[PDB]
């Protein structure tokens, strides 16, 4: 149960500059980023152990993303994963690893949460960049649709009803919530 609120708010300003979000909405969003992080992290670890690797790389994040996410989300996630990893690899450094990856979401904390409790695998540098990029992309997608629902309701901020309606009304988000809340 990491708080991603500040990073969610930054992504919300990127995609709906003039839209707010309610504290109950922000809680659901954090719950959602946690569930997604765990499901992808869990699957990547299993993939490495099954194929008896001693490390989680962006390859195992990539496979996990392709297994868990519906098709269009998976394609955009893979695109955003590879772009963030590539930016970071040729980055100018002298900045947060997130700033090198061109992301708002925190690479360090994703690194920390990929290692904690493992004891059977090391975490590559690309793996947490790829996964932060994917968390950022799926946040942007949810907030885009949630903010569109707030506008239809003539509201200036996102409330829980907007997240519910954006998820039920979008084929891929509705399908994804099957694997993620379990």
């Amino acid at each position: 149960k990491e708080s991603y609120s500040i990073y969610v708010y930054k992504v919300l300003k990127q995609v709906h500059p003039d839209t707010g979000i309610s504290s109950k909405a922000m809680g659901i969003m954090n719950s959602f980023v946690n569930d997604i992080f765990e499901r992808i992290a869990g699957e990547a670890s299993r993939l490495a152990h099954y194929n008896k690797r001693s490390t989680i790389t962006s390859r195992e994040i990539q496979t996990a993303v392709r297994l868990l996410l519906p098709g269009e989300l998976a394609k955009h996630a893979v695109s955003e994963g590879t772009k963030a990893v590539t930016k970071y690899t040729s980055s100018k450094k002298a900045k947060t690893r997130s700033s090198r990856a061109g992301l708002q979401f925190p690479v360090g904390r994703v690194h920390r949460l990929l290692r904690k409790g493992n004891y059977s695998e090391r975490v590559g540098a690309g793996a947490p960049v790829y996964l932060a990029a994917v968390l950022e992309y799926l946040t942007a997608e949810i907030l885009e649709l949630a903010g569109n629902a707030a506008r239809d309701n003539k509201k200036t901020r996102i409330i829980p009803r907007h997240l519910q309606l954006a998820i039920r009304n979008d084929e891929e988000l509705n399908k994804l919530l099957g694997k993620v809340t379990i």
């Binding site: 707010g20 309610s22 504290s23 909405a25 922000m26 409330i159």
Partner: peptide
């Protein structure tokens, strides 16, 4: 009774 999140 659900106030806006601000940073």
């Amino acid at each position: 009774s659900d106030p806006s999140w601000h940073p």
